Design a protein around this ligand. Structure first.
Ligand SMILES: CC(=O)N[C@@H]1[C@@H](O)[C@H](O)[C@@H](CO)O[C@H]1O
Ligand SMILES: CC(=O)N[C@@H]1[C@@H](O)[C@H](O)[C@@H](CO)O[C@H]1O
Ligand SMILES: CC(=O)N[C@@H]1[C@@H](O)[C@H](O)[C@@H](CO)O[C@H]1O
Ligand SMILES: CC(=O)N[C@@H]1[C@@H](O)[C@H](O)[C@@H](CO)O[C@H]1O
Ligand SMILES: CC(=O)N[C@@H]1[C@@H](O)[C@H](O)[C@@H](CO)O[C@H]1O
Ligand SMILES: CC(=O)N[C@@H]1[C@@H](O)[C@H](O)[C@@H](CO)O[C@H]1O
Ligand SMILES: CC(=O)N[C@@H]1[C@@H](O)[C@H](O)[C@@H](CO)O[C@H]1O
Ligand SMILES: CC(=O)N[C@@H]1[C@@H](O)[C@H](O)[C@@H](CO)O[C@H]1O
Ligand SMILES: CC(=O)N[C@@H]1[C@@H](O)[C@H](O)[C@@H](CO)O[C@H]1O
Ligand SMILES: CC(=O)N[C@@H]1[C@@H](O)[C@H](O)[C@@H](CO)O[C@H]1O
Ligand SMILES: *[C@@H]1O[C@H](CO)[C@@H](O)[C@H](O)[C@H]1NC(C)=O
Lengths: 81, 375, 375, 81, 375, 81
């Protein structure tokens, strides 16, 4: 690259940066609870909200769930167990 | 051959990144299973963020995105009187989270479980718990502020229990090594005045340089800092021989396009030095008092302390105490054939005229074919 | 509709889509009028979601996006004391909603009422009530989750009472039918090695195929499922004769551009077979032990069980337990003239060089009419 | 389309899908209340936030309201149907 | 001299806008200093929006985006009873704001303090306070609803106390003046039927016109209303001589590309008359009853009252009304060489074919020179 | 521009607008309190949230703060501005 010649036609190097790549990754496991805990005692009341959310969320994750199981059932390590 | 995988036909048709993700998923088997093993304990705990512990050792973190909100607005007992009112707010809390969930989980592709969970998707998924998870789940030099505000974090779903509605996610923070003898350089253009036109050079705006090699390098899906570019992947693009030559200083191989000039694209400041198109713009020096003019053979003007110590550019008034490096190094002679449009409609028009001209040459070639044959 | 409309002049200049929408607007006069006739009752009802009913007949659903939140923060009786705090919290809730409204109702065009209400706009408009609405307002087999997560639902504003601040909206759910003898097909490319260069084929990434007809069919706005694409508007593009020919198996009419290769773009899994560029990538077979070499007259390698049983690609190791069918020969003769760049800058540089060559072939002609007249 | 030839130069058909169009739609009417209801009794104060919310939302929607009125008033379906 | 600025070299490499912003920032020293002088008073006040006064004179507005929400959930006293409960809810409010902050504050550049604060960034930063702030601190005749719902507002950080975590920001509302003798015109296309092909003209979709000058003007960041366009800057683009000539009515200089036609792109309404491609679409006249045929000499049909009083286009039925000043010779002769694709792949295929045609002429030239010079 | 001719080949001018430009800018100063005030008295409780929010936000605003000081210190008006 010839920055000096380029500037004579109005081309300006505005930033010069290093390139990074990775070799290893630090990992962490998360459990997403999609259903909140309700601790308060329920007496003579149907909270329709919880079941309607349950149903729709469950349906939404169906494809992901079916895919995990196919893979986990048919993609087998000859070394892992 | 540790550790081979069998059954790749299960994936159907899949990219290398997908295959790679599949293999990482089945490696995660044991870890995901050990976590989901505690789904009963995990579920009973009423906490937004909570530790997942197996025999005094931590496997991960349990998060609940709407839990603190829920804890705050529900009465300590649910009666028959309450019901309507409590079904209302609880329902409004869950349906909001549900609406967000539906923005990150659409059923479009063959292997949905292998799609990366992005930081935007993590934000939605973890809600207000995300900063707490980043602050505690990673032990690096990289600040939480930087981890939250960048695309460094990425996740993969490695487990799921639809009954308990629990999704296990593996979050990966890369460990970054500087690639040797490599720079990523951003290029901008101010207008230049060339062969009686206000034009701009047509060049890639970001390039990668290693040795004598130069490639276009939009760091589009990358994490960018003032000194550093991180790319998960590599999106370089091949530059033509002309663009290469031009970037290496053979300026007669550059391409310029006429532009509608404006004040804000007619000059820059480069460490105190002004590079300005002083033909298309009025370059008024206050000391020594002068209008700096730009001769035709100068596409732009370099204004350092030897030219002007105090400059006015319209309403900007400032001093110049620095000096430019004075490599000419030769004559800047540019042809007019270097001035053109790279807009596809324009190229199309150009090509059609070139083809029209070629047809004339072809006919005249068949005509000379006759006068010559008639001898 | 059905029925002859008078007074289209009132629209000024309108697209066919806008005309169509306006006709639907007038068709909805009665429906909107009846709902708005109950504006008083609707406004008196404290509910986030409630049925709008007249004479044992549901006309629709009345929604209030912030009602539950307002209900859970509002004092049972506003007095002189809490008035400062009560107005504070109330004001914040309305203002946040107001802010969201201002992100979807900019007034920019001639007939703003005819603009479609997208699902993104519906999410903002209804807030947490949207799940409840979608679940009840439609008698369909398509799940709420699919409706909430795709672009299938659109609204149109058919009524507005400004005094009561009530906006009637018509939501449509399409009823969809397979187009016969038609497929939408996604094409991906791995790199090939052709005439000493690593390249990729230049083709549209999504096509529509029906009979011998092929068109480019990106479905950017469309709703896509693993098996099905629903588009409201057919957005096909004509392909050239060369692209048609290439897509139909005439590989000499294809176009390839040099690429900067990477691991992740050098192979694919295809139903248990690997298609790989084994020249630019090391394809190491573990059993039998070999390095698969790619003759330069095979652009890519098919690795089925005949060539390898246990394969290693850098860090991936897997068994190939599928056989590929001999749809060969792998030997393909392609010309280097098929290798070129379709980047506008590059095309324009190539056009310039072609023009220059022609420029002096014409000159060589005019000074050949000079030699032909002197003889 | 000849997917066999195409794979020989690295062009991979990754998905094959059906194309759907529609011949009719099921519609539903929603009325959006832009102003929430406050059943709480007011004593000796002005909830000023309601009024300004009102004016602003009202100004925001005037062009749509003006446009609906124009169309509803001047776009008239002729007899029959 | 106004107030000549010293020390621009401290900006490193900066654009004109960055320089301009830098000047404004130092021009704002005293006001920012004056406001931040009251940081302690400001910090102690518990309010979402509060006046910043100095000796009875107001300097600005202190805003706090999560203030009301905190007031509404925080216990009147926090003790070891609460603590866990209070720290839970408070922490989730702060953390949510923090996640929002991280989406608008990511240092990637040299001079982060000079980046504009957009309305999007302003909504995030000010929350529910944004409407109140706009409604008060702008004695203007532009409505809050218009200010909130567009890109007229823009901010600049002019101060920051990290200990108090107070950010001073200068919001500017541009006072706008019409540019005389200038129009911005949006152009749509319906398909035309030309030389046996359904095609669309290829032109910019939005142009600026002043006298005899036309420029592409794709006002992309600009604020658009039905009568006016406001640009903070400029983005005009030069048009080729052919496009200019086309736009000025020399239709033989126009370019058309073949399209996949559809109902919705085959006609428009124009002040009560219809312009339609009545060849690619059935235009059914009901009164006087007849099919409207389109001669090949007419690319599109003008359906005014003289052609049809009552029209049917598929399911659309409406009457046509009189329009003054409508003229057309309707019989245009266009050449098939005007019909071509402006798609980059298609151009490059077109170029490659010309380059080949040329090589055959360069050959013929050589044969015809050895056929000569033998004589 | 010749709309009459353009419409004969299907080019329809759908809008004709005026172009505005900026000349003078009305200004307004805003202080954003990033930290919210807690007037409730705290006893036997460490609200660990305030602290970690502070720390994280502070770090998020390092570069802005440093750029602000650099510019304030180096960029000096002769007699402003
Ligand atoms: C100036 C220079 O470096 N020399 C070469 C030469 O082939 C020519 O001047 C140019 C093309 O015009 O390419 C470069
Ligand atoms: C490159 C192009 O499209 N057209 C050029 C034209 O500008 C020029 O006048 C001619 C003679 O050199 O050569 C060709
Ligand atoms: C002031 C105005 O614009 N008109 C009406 C007015 O009749 C009344 O104050 C109320 C009735 O709903 O709503 C508003
Ligand atoms: C639902 C509601 O509060 N609507 C009010 C209306 O009653 C009032 O007359 C009007 C005055 O402009 O402002 C709005
Ligand atoms: C397999 C096949 O049909 N080959 C054809 C070739 O014969 C033809 O000359 C060319 C047309 O451009 O395209 C290819
Ligand atoms: C830009 C372009 O098309 N140039 C080609 C060139 O690469 C090739 O060597 C020549 C001879 O076939 O024909 C022409
Ligand atoms: C590390 C640091 O800056 N500590 C500050 C301290 O200087 C200041 O006196 C105190 C009161 O605001 O807040 C904290
Ligand atoms: C407004 C606020 O709470 N800011 C505090 C500040 O008082 C303290 O000096 C600093 C210590 O680093 O932590 C933070
Ligand atoms: C009616 C008219 O002005 N047509 C002009 C024609 O004279 C010219 O030869 C060509 C390109 O300029 O086409 C255009
Ligand atoms: C790509 C291109 O423009 N090629 C054209 C071709 O279509 C036409 O048949 C020929 C004679 O008119 O001239 C040339
Ligand atoms: C959700 O619903 C399913 C099926 O009704 C039930 O078995 C399961 O326990 C529920 N899970 C939660 C966490 O609500």
């Amino acid at each position: 690259l010839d920055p000096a010649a380029l500037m004579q036609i109005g081309v300006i190097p505005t930033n010069v940066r290093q390139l990074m790549y990775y070799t290893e990754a630090s990992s962490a496991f998360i459990v997403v609870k999609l259903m909140p805990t309700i601790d308060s005692p329920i007496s003579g009341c149907n909270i329709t909200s919880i079941s309607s959310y349950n149903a729709t969320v469950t349906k939404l994750l169906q494809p992901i769930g079916e895919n995990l199981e196919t893979i986990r059932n048919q993609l087998i390590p000859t070394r892992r167990r | 051959f540790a550790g081979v995988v069998i059954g790749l036909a299960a994936l159907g048709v899949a990219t290398a990144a997908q295959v790679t993700a599949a293999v990482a998923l089945v490696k995660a088997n044991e870890n995901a299973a050990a976590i989901l093993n505690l789904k009963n304990a995990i579920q009973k705990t009423n906490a937004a963020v909570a530790d997942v512990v197996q025999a005094t050792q931590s496997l991960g973190t349990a998060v609940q995105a709407v839990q603190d909100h829920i804890n705050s607005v529900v009465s300590p007992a649910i009666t028959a009187a309450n019901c309507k009112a409590q079904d209302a707010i609880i329902g409004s809390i869950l349906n909001l989270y549900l609406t967000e969930l539906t923005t990150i989980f659409h059923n479009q592709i063959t292997n949905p479980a292998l799609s990366p969970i992005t930081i935007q998707a993590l934000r939605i998924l973890l809600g207000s718990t995300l900063p707490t998870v980043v602050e505690k789940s990673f032990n690096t030099q990289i600040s939480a502020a930087e981890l939250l505000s960048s695309g460094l974090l990425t996740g993969q779903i490695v487990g799921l229990d639809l009954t308990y509605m629990q999704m296990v996610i593996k979050i990966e923070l890369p460990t970054l090594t500087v690639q040797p003898a490599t720079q990523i350089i951003d290029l901008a253009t101010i207008s230049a005045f060339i062969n009686n036109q206000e034009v701009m050079a047509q060049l890639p705006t970001r390039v990668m340089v290693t040795g004598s090699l130069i490639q276009a390098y939009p760091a589009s899906q990358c994490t960018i800092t003032p000194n550093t570019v991180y790319c998960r992947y590599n999106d370089a693009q091949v530059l033509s021989d002309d663009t290469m030559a031009c970037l290496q200083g053979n300026l007669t191989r550059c391409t310029f396009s006429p532009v509608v000039g404006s004040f804000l694209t007619r000059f820059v400041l480069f460490d105190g030095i002004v590079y300005a198109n002083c033909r298309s713009m009025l370059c008024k020096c206050m000391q020594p008092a002068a209008v700096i003019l730009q001769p035709s053979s100068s596409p732009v003007t370099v204004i350092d302390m030897y030219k002007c110590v105090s400059l006015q550019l319209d309403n900007l008034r400032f001093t110049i105490t620095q000096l430019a490096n004075v490599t000419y190094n030769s004559t800047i002679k540019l042809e007019s054939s270097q001035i053109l449009s790279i807009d596809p409609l324009d190229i199309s028009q150009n090509l059609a005229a070139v083809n029209k001209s070629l047809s004339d040459a072809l006919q005249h070639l068949a005509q000379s074919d006759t006068y010559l044959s008639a001898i």
